[PDB]
Structure 1
Amino acid sequence: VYLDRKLLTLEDKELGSGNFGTVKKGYYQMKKVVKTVAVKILKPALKDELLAEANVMQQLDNPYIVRMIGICEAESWMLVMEMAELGPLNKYLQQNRHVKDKNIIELVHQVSMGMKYLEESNFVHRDLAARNVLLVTQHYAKISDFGLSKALRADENYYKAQWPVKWYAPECINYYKFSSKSDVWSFGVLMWEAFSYGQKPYRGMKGSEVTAMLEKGERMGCPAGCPREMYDLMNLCWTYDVENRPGFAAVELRLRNY
């Protein structure tokens, strides 16, 4: 899974950044054709964290998950992935307010299929948000940013940590337990973000203020122009009790029929 640095050419402009360091556009010389790529370039536990991210991506093979090309150890550690040219979903929608709601449903349904696969694979994403959905085209979305993801043990359906608070279900905040159902709650917030054309959720509120609101049974309101069925699904994703909240099979199934 180890790439040749001479076969990788990086562009100076940067696509994004994270605690890991920077993301740059590049080109990798494949078997004959050259492939456009996005490269995460490492800036102390980050190397192990980047390698863990690569380990998850190596195991995943689904049309709605960003594909990794490989890793390269050169001037810095690099995670080379196929390029999703149109970038993060939230920024795209902030700049393209005329996408049809039908178009949004198609994109959020694609996200549920990638997440259904991840759930079937017993991986939890733990960072599912509109900023981590990338557009290949306006009609093809892929899930990215597996830096926090975990492979669940064969005998448990959750990972217990020893944070993007606004995307986390109550059981994550209160008990530190992350499951596919926790990702479902995030998917509900992601849906809200998508239908709000990339506005931030719980605008102007502290994480502790968000937690108090949810405990009161309050939820974000319906974004302007959002179809009732999609708001209803969001509310179902925001079911307080992990046991009664739907899984991705149920979410994906509802989205497919709609």
Structure 2
Amino acid sequence: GEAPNQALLRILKETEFKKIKVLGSGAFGTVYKGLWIPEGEKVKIPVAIKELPKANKEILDEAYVMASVDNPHVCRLLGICLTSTVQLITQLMPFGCLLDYVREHKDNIGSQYLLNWCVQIAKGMNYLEDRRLVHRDLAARNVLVKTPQHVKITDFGLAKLLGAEYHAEGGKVPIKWMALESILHRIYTHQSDVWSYGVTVWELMTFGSKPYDGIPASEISSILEKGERLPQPPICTIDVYMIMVKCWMIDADSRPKFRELIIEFSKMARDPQRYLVIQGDDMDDVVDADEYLIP
């Protein structure tokens, strides 16, 4: 009913990290790659730096959330830099986001990886529920790939923190990943995130397809109320597709809880091809951020 948030917000000097290349702009703003070298700490840490005015209130809300999480399947904030622009520094995920990764390696992704990814995404999502945190923007584009065997959830710009059912007021929302009760009444729950988890899994099983492609977002409310959902992907058995359909039920409380999605996909992961049918199944002192722990 209280629980003080004793997370540490580290302030990083601009002379500590060396930007190396621009990763790309769009949606938000500039995202860099670089190395972060703490002064006299004999380490070099590959990092990603974000920036884009008084939008600083929005970027600092994301820094508040990113610094308040600690889970192997959720990207944590390493620190911020308060130079002429406000920078967000996090661990570099070298293989990009999962959406672009699954699109580029279509013909070389096995069932074991697809099922392992859903287990890990469900693990990070169940952790966010333990922190009473509603992501509100779960998608394949917001899942980054550290290694092909290790993914993490990112982008907390819309993440809201509950206590002991959030009502939104802002503008741009991703309609095609949102639960029905969020499109109509702007209600967001941990079960609202489960709906987005189902759409996220559907993205992976279709190897990067766009949900409701060619359908205007204004008609999504009409379609889902009539009982229509996303189609069964070709590679998915009815066992896998039944789980997707369960996350899209009207009653918010049937959508499996994230702890149950961990279990179901775990058991499918120990026999992957029974449930997915796929055709043909100075770099010296560099430390990964996951092995750099500060008290």
**Bin of the TM-score, shorter chain as denominator length:** over 0.9
Q: Is the 8 Å Cα contact of residues 88 and 130 (structure 1) preserved in structure 2?
A: yes
Residue of structure 1 in register with 2:278 after alignment: none
Report the structure number with the largest CA radius of gyration.
Answer: 2
Q: Superposed, which structure 2 residues align to 1:100-115 within 5 Å?
A: 100-115=110-125
Query: Residue type of the partner of 2:168?
Result: A
Residue of structure 2 in register with 1:144 after alignment: 154
SS of the residue aligned with 2:144? strand
Q: 2:185 & 2:256 partners in 1: Cα distance?
A: 19
Q: Does 2:170 correspond to 1:160?
A: no
Q: Does 2:53 correspond to 1:44?
A: yes
Gaps of 5+ in 2: 1-9, 269-295
Q: 1:17-43, CA deviations, whole angstroms, 9 ceiling, x for partnerless residues?
A: 323x111111100332110011111x2
Q: 1:246 & 1:69 partners in 2: Cα distance?
A: 32
Q: Does 2:132 correspond to 1:122?
A: yes
Shift in Å, 1:198: 1.0
Higher strand share: 1
Residue of structure 2 in register with 1:68 after alignment: 77
Q: 1:213 & 1:79 partners in 2: Cα distance?
A: 39
Is 231-240 or 43-52 further displaced after alignment? 43-52
Q: 1:102 & 1:44 partners in 2: Cα distance?
A: 46
Query: Residue type of the partner of 2:64?
Result: N
Shift in Å, 1:74: 1.3
Residue of structure 2 in register with 1:200 after alignment: 210
Q: Is the 8 Å Cα contact of residues 247 and 254 (structure 2) preserved in structure 1?
A: no
Q: 1:144-183, CA deviations, whole angstroms, 9 ceiling, x for partnerless residues?
A: 001110111x23xx21113100000001111111111011
Residue of structure 2 in register with 1:26 after alignment: 34
Residue of structure 1 in register with 2:194 after alignment: 184
Q: Is the 8 Å Cα contact of residues 28 and 37 (structure 1) preserved in structure 2?
A: yes
Q: 1:256 & 1:80 partners in 2: Cα distance?
A: 32
Shift in Å, 1:209: 1.8
Q: 2:214 & 2:115 partners in 1: Cα distance?
A: 27
Q: Is the 8 Å Cα contact of residues 134 and 141 (structure 1) preserved in structure 2?
A: yes
SS of the residue aligned with 2:88? strand
Q: 2:102 & 2:191 partners in 1: Cα distance?
A: 26
Equivalenced residues, count: 253
Higher relative contact order (CA 8 A, sep 6+): 2
Q: 1:12 & 1:245 partners in 2: Cα distance?
A: 42
Q: 1:104-128, CA deviations, whole angstroms, 9 ceiling, x for partnerless residues?
A: 1101110000000001110000110
CA RMSD of superposed structures (Å): 1.3
Query: Residue type of the partner of 2:156?
Result: F
Q: 1:5-61, CA deviations, whole angstroms, 9 ceiling, x for partnerless residues?
A: 001111233245323x111111100332110011111x2342111111111111100
Query: Residue type of the partner of 2:30?
Result: T
Query: Residue type of the partner of 2:251?
Result: D
Q: Is the 8 Å Cα contact of residues 90 and 199 (structure 1) preserved in structure 2?
A: no
Q: 1:177 & 1:246 partners in 2: Cα distance?
A: 18
Shift in Å, 1:249: 1.7
Residue 39 to residue 17, structure 1, CA distance change in 2 (3 Å): farther
Q: Does 2:246 correspond to 1:242?
A: no
Is 220-229 or 126-135 further displaced after alignment? 220-229
Gaps of 5+ in 1: none
Q: Is the 8 Å Cα contact of residues 16 and 24 (structure 1) preserved in structure 2?
A: no
Say which of 214, 225, 233 aligns to 1:215: 225
